């Protein structure tokens, strides 16, 4: 294994030859440990609190989920506990028959996904444009430096020779240029899956890439119209740690569709940084803090360019395999058989494949499946054998499905169908309210002024007005935040890193105008384009549903907050200063 990773470890070792040592008390059991060096400890035991949101959500000061979210340990201690609890495991190799059906399905799926689209290399100027639009970090400074691109070119030449010198995953500007350079090179070779929307619903059938949270519920409602069994949405326990060497070799098959110069670079990413990887992780010691150098041949590196798309691919494949087992196409005997009949798998894929993909909504490790009947609930042999063991359920207990699409969990949400006062139906996204408030109360970074804090608060408020307006407490808190923050202050930072967020709330445009654009004008499931002219006609969940989903409506403390909210707004305004404010209450 040293022939692939040796050069990276040699460069790390030489850069820290003063403090480099082999810590024999290292806690790694399934990862190869190469050595350690001294570092300055990074992270925090607690997250910073957004005072603007906190002051305008007083009843949630006494809420346990709101307190828990404010914690999250990122210190070397936090890094180590997460590592031990999840990442330091080995997935048993799938059986020979399971490997065979996965290989057949992966070959058919890649050909289906590439039926209209051709892979291509992504560029420096594409990466540059993405970095600029995201910052509008030190990444914008690097991208502007010609020496950054010269470091990139030197690494690419090693990749072209089948070698890697500086692409290290992390759990001086030279080390930062090497990390961003590593990410650019991955973007160059595999970025096309995202940039050219290979996992869009039109291209992939099961996929939802580019859809946006406001479309997911409508897609689940459409799947519910397909004849079949219940809708299943099983969670995998730590999906990224369950990506096997066999999964990685099946994902690598996309390189067969590439032009020769592209194939060479993508083969370098797969073989040197996915199937072999060098990882840095911080660890507390009695003496201080060390950086450990570790390696392994499987699992998925969570913070990589190709992660979302490749997880979506492998999950689509795994769910098709589970549907084949449910239909009796794959038997227990087939999974143990290296010599299983390839023809019946091929025949099912060619005649039923696409129809079975349309029965699913797949976003990375998140899946919703509506099989042809409920035999799927007990079809667990291939799923468990592929390593995709379901979270917090005995291995052989049947999956429980839903017969109502509104009860289905997907991407941390569930979806409600609302009837507007004018008779039109809306399908809206929702999650436990404490989660929404708890997140909005967390600020991103230290040494952030009242201005930056208030602008992030406004970004959360405006996200609530656009996606979660149907929650009484969030509409009231949103109105309060937007009344407390100067009208012309532009929302900053980001409320989420979800691929499903399109950030339409990152504006100073009227939120009702934006609401009409998203929910009426652009909404393909809204035939009648009549605009809503007042928030009074923007619906809420039924009161009982709002309460079931965490609303404090009906509580005295909530009634007191609603009554006295102009006082808290004025208190925020007085600390912000003599600025232009608008009264949204
Ligand atoms: C599928 O959509 C989402 C899923 C999640 C997970 C988040 C999200 O960040 N949640 S979070 O902060 O509470 C959170 C943070 C970190 C890890 C988590 C793990 C599990 C659950 N939450 C986590 C946000 C959105 C969106 C919010 C608005 C959206 C829109 C639109 C239209 O353009 S899309
Ligand atoms: Zn490299
Ligand atoms: Zn709900």
PDB file of C-alpha atoms in Angstrom, residues 406-410 412-416 428-432 549:
ATOM      1  CA  UNK A 406     -47.127  13.009   4.196  1.00  0.00           C
ATOM      2  CA  UNK A 407     -45.714  10.712   6.922  1.00  0.00           C
ATOM      3  CA  UNK A 408     -42.538   9.857   4.953  1.00  0.00           C
ATOM      4  CA  UNK A 409     -39.216  11.244   6.300  1.00  0.00           C
ATOM      5  CA  UNK A 410     -36.821  12.453   3.550  1.00  0.00           C
ATOM      6  CA  UNK A 412     -34.621  15.593   7.529  1.00  0.00           C
ATOM      7  CA  UNK A 413     -38.127  16.778   6.596  1.00  0.00           C
ATOM      8  CA  UNK A 414     -41.649  15.525   6.047  1.00  0.00           C
ATOM      9  CA  UNK A 415     -44.213  17.296   3.805  1.00  0.00           C
ATOM     10  CA  UNK A 416     -47.778  18.582   4.309  1.00  0.00           C
ATOM     11  CA  UNK A 428     -44.925  22.352   2.005  1.00  0.00           C
ATOM     12  CA  UNK A 429     -41.713  21.185   3.776  1.00  0.00           C
ATOM     13  CA  UNK A 430     -41.636  20.802   7.574  1.00  0.00           C
ATOM     14  CA  UNK A 431     -39.481  19.478  10.441  1.00  0.00           C
ATOM     15  CA  UNK A 432     -39.674  19.573  14.314  1.00  0.00           C
ATOM     16  CA  UNK A 549     -44.820  19.461  14.704  1.00  0.00           C
TER      17      UNK A 549
END
